[PDB]
Ligand binder design. Sequence first.
Ligand SMILES: COc1cccc(N(C)C(=S)Oc2ccc3c(c2)CCCC3)n1
Length: 275
Amino acid sequence: VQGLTEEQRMMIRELMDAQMKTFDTTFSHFKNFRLPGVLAAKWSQVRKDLCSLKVSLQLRGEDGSVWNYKPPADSGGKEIFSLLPHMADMSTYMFKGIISFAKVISYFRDLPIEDQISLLKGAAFELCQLRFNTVFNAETGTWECGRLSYCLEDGFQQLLLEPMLKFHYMLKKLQLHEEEYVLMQAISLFSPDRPGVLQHRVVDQLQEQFAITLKSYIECNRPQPAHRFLFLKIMAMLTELRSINAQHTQRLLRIQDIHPFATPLMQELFGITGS
Ligand SMILES: COc1cccc(N(C)C(=S)Oc2ccc3c(c2)CCCC3)n1
């Protein structure tokens, strides 16, 4: 790109290299996942917690066959948990790609292992949502995950009330480059204020370099009036994503409390000990 320092161009490359190596955009290796079965104040809030992300699910076979699953309606029972096992498998698959992404980046390997763990615990969800946005189809409200499709159930303005859905639509509208998505991932990963981080100074210095690189990238490759304040818009979305992360963590722990579903990797990322 233009106007970047050699160190910034190298920084952008290694992020792009790590994204290329660890983001299976066709989801070809997402396999052996569970699928929905065939044929007191907690519950009110878990009932409200689960209805926030209502999606149907399509599976296109290599032979051309199509399986499609329409979820039930909430009717006061355990049917609200039908996609929990499948969604756990997908998020687990994505978390593994995220962990692989961090471990390739030199700036991440060079951190102490305890801080590596702390940063991944704090940012794994956010980097997952950033990767899902690149396969989000805002015209059809569908995350195109290769042979899997997650379609939002029916208007458009009433769904933007859901913060994570609003995030995906608003982030998609910015029409970001691959380089800007991966820089967002690095900024979110290297957040110095996550619980348990010890090397706050180096992590803060690294994050600042990633933000400066992103600011510089935008200024060198986006002169259009539509991209005025784009960097600031991106940074605001990252703050919103952190809020959504905290929201979603409390959501998940409440559902986990009355209906266990978290995989071992999810338990590790969310602090669940097993006792
Ligand atoms: C109760 O909270 C839960 C339950 C189970 C899994 C999760 N996680 C951690 C994640 S990343 O779920 C998502 C979030 C967004 C999306 C998908 C999964 C799949 C495709 C559509 C976009 N969260």
